[PDB]
Structure formats: structure tokens, C-alpha cells
């Protein structure tokens, strides 16, 4: 197994996957690394199994159809994995915890949103469709762009949104377009 957390790239108290060489901090994995379960398989491995059990699940899909899917166990998992892929980027730090807004010439968003809030919402099964999760994720970046206006820091929102969107298209096998 790797000697650093796959998500945050630090050492520490790591739980090792049995079916791949990745390792995780307990609360870096999503869902949080399960208490017992020998062998244990990480979310990467669980996602690869879904694909292997249903090869056709990789054929292209329309985003509108994906969004309307109910959050059954496989879609729950896919959203957990997509959230984890965002946390994998170090620039996720800016969007992880609860923000506050006091900048001359700007007003804060009407509906603040942050990664840890989305993480709790997933854990608490608060989303009934994929659309709920995706809307909250895109709101994070939209709030950031609106608030920061012409400050160059707006780019951090563009950057992490691009990570989100590329991973969304991959995980949910969105049909490729120009
Ligand atoms: Zn970690
Ligand atoms: Zn694994
Ligand atoms: Zn099949």
C-alpha cells in the first residue's frame, strides 16, 4: 500500500485498501472508513466494480437524465466518489469549511454552500436525486464567482469547478460532445 493518504497526500493514521494499493485517513475517505470489514475495499475499488458488473454503464448519457436519477445505493456511491475527487485537489481547501463574507463592494450569497456541508448532507441521506447534490456543488463555485467579482481570486472557483465538472462527466459517463 501507499504510505500517504490518497486524498490529502499526507502521512498519518492510514487505513489500507485490500484490493488496491491506496490508503486513507479515516475522514478523508468518503464514506468515512468503515469500523470493521476485513477485507475492506475503498471507494475507487467499489466504483470500478460497478463498471465491471455492468460494462454498458459506460456508454454515453445525457446530463438531464443523470440529474433526475433517484439516489439509490449506486448513485449515492457515485456522488460520494465525485465529492472525494474534489477533495483530492489541494485547492478544495478554500471551499471546505463554512465561508464568511465581508468585502467592500460585495454582498454575500443568499445561500452559502461548502464542501463539508455537502459531505454531511450525503452522509445524512438528504439528497433524493442526483440533481440535489449537483446543484449544491455547482452553487459553491457560482457563489464564489459572484462574490469575488473582478478579484483574481475568482479563478480558484473556476479551477475547482473544472475538476468537479470533468469528474462528473467521467463518473456518470456523460456523452462526449464538442
Ligand atoms: Zn488524508
Ligand atoms: Zn481500493
Ligand atoms: Zn450488465
Amino acid at each position: 500500500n501507499s504510505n500517504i493518504c490518497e486524498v490529502c497526500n499526507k502521512w498519518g493514521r492510514l487505513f489500507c485498501c485490500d484490493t488496491c494499493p491506496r490508503s486513507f485517513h479515516e475522514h478523508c475517505h468518503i464514506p468515512s472508513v468503515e469500523a470493521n470489514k476485513n477485507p475492506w475495499s475503498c471507494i475507487f475499488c467499489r466504483i470500478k466494480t460497478i463498471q465491471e458488473r455492468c460494462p454498458e454503464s459506460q456508454s454515453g448519457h445525457q446530463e438531464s437524465e443523470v440529474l433526475m436519477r433517484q439516489m439509490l445505493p449506486e448513485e449515492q456511491l457515485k456522488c460520494e466518489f465525485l465529492l472525494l475527487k474534489v477533495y483530492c485537489d489541494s485547492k478544495s481547501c478554500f471551499f471546505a469549511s463554512e465561508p464568511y463574507y465581508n468585502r467592500e463592494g460585495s454582498q454575500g450569497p443568499q445561500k452559502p454552500m461548502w464542501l463539508n456541508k455537502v459531505k454531511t448532507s450525503l452522509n445524512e441521506q438528504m439528497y433524493t436525486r442526483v440533481e440535489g447534490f449537483v446543484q449544491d456543488m455547482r452553487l459553491i463555485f457560482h457563489n464564489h464567482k459572484e462574490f469575488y467579482r473582478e478579484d483574481k481570486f475568482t479563478r480558484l472557483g473556476i479551477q475547482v469547478q473544472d475538476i468537479f465538472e470533468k469528474n462528473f462527466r467521467n463518473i456518470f459517463a456523460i456523452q462526449e460532445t464538442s
Side-chain angles (χ1 to χ4, degrees), residues 1-36 38-178:
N1 291 85
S2 180
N3 313 329
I4 54 172
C5 182
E6 189 77 358
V7 184
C8 72
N9 300 108
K10 296 290 195 279
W11 180 72
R13 182 54 192 120
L14 304 174
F15 300 87
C16 288
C17 185
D18 290 309
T19 50
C20 80
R22 302 174 174 94
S23 312
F24 308 81
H25 300 97
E26 179 165 10
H27 296 315
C28 282
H29 198 271
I30 308 178
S32 288
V33 169
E34 297 72 13
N36 209 287
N38 320 56
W40 180 74
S41 274
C42 79
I43 187 151
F44 292 81
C45 283
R46 298 168 68 189
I47 289 287
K48 186 210 299 309
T49 295
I50 301 316
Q51 283 169 19
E52 290 178 345
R53 290 182 167 151
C54 284
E56 67 273 28
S57 71
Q58 302 162 283
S59 294
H61 299 79
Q62 297 298 108
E63 176 173 318
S64 60
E65 177 270 319
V66 166
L67 299 185
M68 293 305 318
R69 296 178 190 163
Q70 298 181 14
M71 290 282 263
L72 294 180
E74 294 191 353
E75 304 316 301
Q76 175 80 30
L77 197 73
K78 286 176 165 204
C79 294
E80 289 165 348
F81 187 46
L82 178 47
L83 180 57
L84 174 139
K85 282 292 192 155
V86 175
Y87 282 101
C88 289
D89 198 283
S90 64
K91 292 162 178 280
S92 71
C93 68
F94 295 110
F95 299 106
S97 68
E98 187 174 1
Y100 62 85
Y101 299 95
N102 194 4
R103 184 199 189 234
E104 184 185 327
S106 290
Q107 272 290 330
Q110 305 290 313
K111 185 177 168 180
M113 196 47 60
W114 59 102
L115 304 166
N116 297 347
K117 186 174 170 66
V118 177
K119 185 180 278 196
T120 295
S121 297
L122 274 175
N123 176 242
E124 292 178 2
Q125 301 163 300
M126 299 291 309
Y127 298 113
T128 57
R129 293 172 194 270
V130 174
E131 183 176 45
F133 165 81
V134 171
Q135 284 172 342
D136 276 355
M137 295 289 290
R138 288 170 168 167
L139 181 64
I140 297 172
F141 313 116
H142 191 259
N143 282 352
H144 178 96
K145 290 166 82 160
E146 296 301 299
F147 180 71
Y148 291 107
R149 304 290 201 114
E150 311 301 290
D151 194 292
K152 66 195 175 168
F153 190 59
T154 58
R155 182 161 173 259
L156 269 296
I158 293 168
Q159 292 174 325
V160 183
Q161 183 151 22
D162 194 43
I163 301 292
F164 173 74
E165 292 299 341
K166 284 182 187 275
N167 282 282
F168 172 72
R169 292 188 302 268
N170 179 262
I171 291 165
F172 288 91
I174 297 296
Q175 175 60 50
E176 290 277 289
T177 53
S178 61

